[model samples]
Structure formats: C-alpha cells, structure tokens
Target chain A: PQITLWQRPIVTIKIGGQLKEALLNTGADDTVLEEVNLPGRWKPKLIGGIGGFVKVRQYDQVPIEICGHKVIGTVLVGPTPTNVIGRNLMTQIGCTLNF
Target chain B: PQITLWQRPIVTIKIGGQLKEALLNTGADDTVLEEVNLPGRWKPKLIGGIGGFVKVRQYDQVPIEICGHKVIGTVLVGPTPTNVIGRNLMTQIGCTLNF
Candidate 1:
C-alpha cells in the first residue's frame, strides 16, 4: 500500500516592492523572510525562535504578496541568500504538502 | 529588479518497507520521521535536541535514499503528521530549495 504524503505547491512572494521573488517552503517550520535584499533603513529587534531559547534579531513585519494573497509577517533581517515562507503561515490557510 | 532566493527542489524518500515517501523540508530545523507509519519493532532512545534540553528518543539511524543520494541519519521517532527531511541534510548535499 502506498501512503499519501502531504506536500504543498510552491508559492511565490514579493517583498519591499524591491525584491519581488520569494518562495513558500512547506517543509520549513517557521517563516524565513530575508530582509537583506530589501532597500530602505530596517529596524531590527530580537525575537524568540522555536523552543523559545535562542533569540534572533528580526526586522519589523512588512506587507507581502503571495500568489495575489496579502499577509504581514516579520522579516528575518540577517545575511541569507534567499527568503522562504514557512509552514506557520501556510498551516493557517489549511494548506497541505504532498511530496 | 529581481532578487534571487536560494531554494532547493523537493526530494522524495522512502523509509522502512511500509513508509515509502517523505519530503525534504528546507525550512525545518531538523529531520522528522513519523514512526506511526512504520512496521515491525522499533527501539526508542532519548536524544538531545537543538539546545540540548529537550530529550527525545530517536529510532536508530536508518538509511534513506534521497533523489538517488543515500545517507544515514537518526530518525526522530514520534507521532507526526508526516516525515520531513531537514536543511542539515539538504545543505550537506548542496541542494537549495527554490521556494
């Protein structure tokens, strides 16, 4: 018998009106927004991560457009090559991933 | 202008003989394998997580073939909705998630 695996389609997102390409990662547990690609001055603050022990500085929440759907999520302002939308946001929309 | 985001393709993996499909999750901090779907006897051992505080037993490191690439890693034996391959493995393979 073949078991069904839940995987979600990749969703594209735009940020800061400048960097207009991001993907929603279904495997990721948290939303990772890369703020290094954004223009303009960014305000940073330390926020607790999963397990609530390690704290990382994150930029303020910004408006993001995903597949024409708009949502606000804080940006992880650090040195990262790309941005990834996590399961936290996707789960809220009742989305499942099949892979 | 378009900014590049590094994302890797979703790789499917088979575990045990019963559970034969799992997705590589780029956003997950660790690899999660659902033991509920597995067959035969499973040995549980407590292991330290991230910060080394949360102790969770993991079924022995099982061999998994990912996208034709095979590797062995300790499976987090627990009740999860699905199995997920984490960034640690993806990074080792130099696979980037596009989304």
Candidate 2:
C-alpha cells in the first residue's frame, strides 16, 4: 500500500505598504491575511465563517507583482501575521505543484 | 487624535475534498493552510518565504462557490485552517468594511 501527500504551487506575491511580499498557496482552503501593510480603497460587508462572521468594517487591496507577474488585487488592510496570501490567488494563477 | 483600525469585508467560502467553510481575511498577508482534509490535482513550485521557500509538490484546488457569488477562483487544496477564503476573493467581490 502507498500513502500519498499533496503539495501545490507556492507563488510569490509583492504587496504594497508594510507587506512587501508573500507566497500564494492553492493548497490553503481558507484565506487568512495575517499582516496589514498596504491599505487601499474599499467598502464593508459582514462575512460568515467557523467562529461566526464578523462585521467587516475596514480593509483594502494593492497592486501586486507575483514572480514578475503583476495583478491588481485586494489585500486585507490590517496588521496580521506578516504577509497575506491564500487560495483565491492560487486558483487565479492556475498553479500546480510537483512531488 | 482618532486612530482608525481598518476592517475589510469577511466572506464565507465552501471548499471541496476536505476543507468545509472559512472566513476570507484581507488583512492576512500569508495564506496559511493549517488543516489537511481535502486533496486535489496540482504541480510543485519552490515558494520562498520568511522562513525560506519550500518545494511544494502535492496540492489541488476545488471549485469553490462563495456565498451568493459566482467566480472561478482557486482555493488551496489541503486540510487548511478550515475552509479557504481571503483578500483575493474580497477584491473580486469588491468587498468593503464600515466602522
């Protein structure tokens, strides 16, 4: 019998403000912006999740350069873990991984 | 003086394979897939980070259907923190937060 482990592509993304760069992972199920660096223009909406939804009242997005690939996208405007990158980006790029 | 804390819209996402539901955070810089429930197809890439890049080889992205939103995006295929949601989605939906 053989057990298999999955690994996906991790792309590098350059964000504005405090977060300079991050690795986008498609293997991630939930998008978690751990750092707040670049704050751009945005509106508000109340989203839901496991611990219940929070009334999101502030945030932003910045133009990013991913491995020389530039795209304008949104980044949570707050101070989090360090940088922000997640699944949505993974799928957009249609990235893949090899093991 | 008024110190404003930015809060962006938080959206809910449903993933395939293993991950179920999750809240998308734009403030988060690094997308951390903590849980390993679902697995999908993908390729490998060397993703550099604060701790150095890892050669990701196994992963996939399930067609995710956001809450009342229709868009083809990628979610990290793994046992992420739960479900995968983040700033990318937020920007796609043109999300915002009000305080």
Candidate 3:
C-alpha cells in the first residue's frame, strides 16, 4: 500500500486499543505520543528532536495499529507537541520514500 | 527513484550550491535549514512543531536540489535541531510513503 504525502503526513493509529492521530515522522527514531496510559512499567528516557530533548517513558513491545496493520514495538510517552509515528513502527509497516 | 526508509530518513540535499544532509521529515510542514546565507529578501515567520514554535526567516522560491531533482519552494531558516526536508519540497520530488 502507498500513501500520498499531504500538507503533513498525519494518520490515524491505534495504540493501547485507542485510536489517535499521529504524524508520520521519518526523522524521528522512536515513536512518541503525548502522555498516555500503559499497562506495564517503563524506563525513563530522553528523546531529542527539532527543539531539544524531552524526558519520556519508554515502553517496549507495545502494539500499534497503522492502516490496519498491527506492529508491536517501543513507544515513548511524553509531553510531545503531537503524537508521532516514527521509523520504529514505520518500518514494520513497510513504509518507504519513493520519488 | 525509490529509497528505503532508514532508521532516520536522512538524505543529501543541495541548497544554495552547498551540499548538506537533511532528514526527510513528513511531520514538518515546510522545509527548515540551519542558518545559511541566501540572495533574496525574506520575511520573518514562526513555525511550530513537536516541541514548540520557533522564529525563522522564510525565503520563497529558493532552489533546492534533492536526488538530482530541482525543486523551488519556501525555505525556513532558523535554529533547528537538524536540517529537515518537509512535505512542501517532497511533493515537488514526487516522494511518497510506500509499503
């Protein structure tokens, strides 16, 4: 499946059995979401991006559904400006950059 | 041409005759670069992202070459975490998200 790039690559994703909108960020190395509830204990980590670094809770093996495809991987919960689906999960969905 | 999504979609781009590495960021709305000298007059603008909004100098009709494809569009210069090629220029190069 191929998706056209819009003004912003915002997409619907299911995390923790909840649907949410997230930006498909190829620049991000890890998936980040605004503060969310998870079942397991996570390690505290820092993620750096366009601005600076932000402390986040890193959860492993979290199930995320994108475009009906389910992928279980690491998810970071923090005070992000927006939810972002990064390469960690994008790869699982077989996303590529085509020109 | 199609490129596989790396852990980070970093690519070589030519801006103002200078070669630089940029992240192929679908989350960003406009292309952003670190401080660089441009020939034309630009307007001050603010751009917001995963962290917060930052002030930038917006240059219009800036010619940039990506993967040998020439794309002229708006470029924002500021203190960015990294050089980011957003959807504005990606569309010109016909880049897409493929599975």
Each candidate's B-chain TM-score, in sequence, is: 0.55, 0.50, 0.90
RMSD of 1: 10.7
| Ranking of candidates on DockQ, top first | 3, 1, 2
lDDT of 2 at A30: 29
For residues A1-99, write the lDDT of model 1, one tens digit per residue. 111222223456667675455545655555665544655445555444445543344555556666665666656655334466665555433344322
Candidate 2 ranges with C-alpha deviation above 4 Å: A1-12, A17-23, A27-32, A37-39, A54-61, A79-84, A97-99, B1-99
Question: Could you tell me how far off, in angstroms, the CA of residue B62 lies in candidate 2 after the best superposition?
Answer: 23
Across B1-78, the per-residue lDDT of candidate 2 in tens digits comes to: 111122222334554444235544433332334453445466664543534555544443335555555554444433
Could you arrange the candidates by lDDT from highest to lowest? 3, 1, 2
Candidate 3 lDDT tens digits, A2-87:
76776677888888768889988887788899857888979999767434667899999998898788888899998877889888
Best by TM-score: 3
Task: Give the TM-scores of the predictions, in the order they appear.
Answer: 0.41, 0.35, 0.89
Model 1 spans with C-alpha error above 4 angstroms: A1-24, A28-99, B1-11, B36-56
State the TM-score for model 3: 0.89
- Tens-digit per-residue lDDT, B10-73, candidate 1: 4567666543556566455566766535443456654434455443445555676666567766
Per-residue lDDT, model 3, residue A68, is: 80
Better of 1 and 3 by lDDT: 3
Candidate 2's C-alpha lDDT? 0.42
